[PDB]
Amino acid sequence: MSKTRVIYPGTFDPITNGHVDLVTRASRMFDEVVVAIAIGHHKNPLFSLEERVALAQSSLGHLSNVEFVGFDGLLVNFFKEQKATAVLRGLRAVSDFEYEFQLANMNRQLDPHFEAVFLTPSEQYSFISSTLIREIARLKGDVTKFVPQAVVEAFERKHQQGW
Ligand SMILES: CC(C)(COP(=O)(O)OP(=O)(O)OC[C@H]1O[C@@H](n2cnc3c(N)ncnc32)[C@H](O)[C@@H]1O)[C@@H](O)C(=O)NCCC(=O)NCCS
Numbered sequence: 001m002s003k004t005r006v007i008y009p010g011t012f013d014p015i016t017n018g019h020v021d022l023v024t025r026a027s028r029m030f031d032e033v034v035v036a037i038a039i040g041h042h043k044n045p046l047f048s049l050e051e052r053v054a055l056a057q058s059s060l061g062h063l064s065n066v067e068f069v070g071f072d073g074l075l076v077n078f079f080k081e082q083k084a085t086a087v088l089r090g091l092r093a094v095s096d097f098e099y100e101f102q103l104a105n106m107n108r109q110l111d112p113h114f115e116a117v118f119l120t121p122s123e124q125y126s127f128i129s130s131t132l133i134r135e136i137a138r139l140k141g142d143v144t145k146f147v148p149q150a151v152v153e154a155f156e157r158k159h160q161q162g163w
Pocket residue numbers: 009010011012013016017018019022038073074075076089090091092096103107120121125126127128129130
C-alpha cells in the first residue's frame with residue numbers, strides 16, 4: 001500500500017532495444033523505475049555520461065514513471081539513498097545468472113533491506129549486448145535493428161569525429 005521504486009543500474013553504453021524492453025516491462029509492474037547509469041570513472045566507457053543519459057531519455061522519456069540519473073559508488077549506498085524497493089537486472093546467459101546470484105547475495109549482506117528481481121529478455125532481444133553492438137558499429141556494420149535511431153545517429157557522429 002506504500003509505493004514501489006525499482007532501480008535499473010547499468011553502463012548503458014549504449015542503451016539497446018534490449019534494455020528498452022526491460023524498462024518498459026518493468027514500468028508496468030512498479031510505480032517508479034529509475035534508469036541508473038554507472039558513470040564508470042575508472043572503467044572507460046565509449047559514450048560519456050551525458051551521451052548515455054541523453055540516448056536513454058530520448059528512448060524511454062515517453063514513459064511517465066521513468067527517471068534517469070547518473071551514479072557512482074557502491075550500488076547499495078545508491079539503493080539506500082534512493083529509498084528503493086529493489087534492483088532490477090536482466091539475465092541473458094548462464095554467466096549473467098551466476099554473477100548476479102553472487103552479487104545479490106553479497107549486497108544482501110551489506111544491506112539486509114537490499115533486493116534483486118530479474119527479468120529474462122524476449123527471444124527477439126536475447127542476442128543483443130552493448131559490447132557486441134559497440135564492436136559491430138566499430139567495424140562499420142549496421143546496428144539499426146538492435147538499437148534506437150538516436151543511437152544509430154550517435155554512432156555516425158563518432159564515425160564523423162573519425163572512429
Ligand atoms: C553491474 C554493473 C557493472 C553494470 O552492469 P552492465 O555493465 O551489465 O551494464 P549493461 O548496461 O550492459 O546492462 C544492464 C543490465 O541489463 C541486462 N541486459 C543488457 N542487455 C540486455 C538484453 N538485450 N536483454 C535483457 N537484458 C539485458 C544486463 O544483463 C545487465 O544486468 C553496475 O551495476 C555496477 O558496477 N554497480 C556499482 C559498483 C558496485 O557496487 N560493484 C561491486 C559491489 S556490487
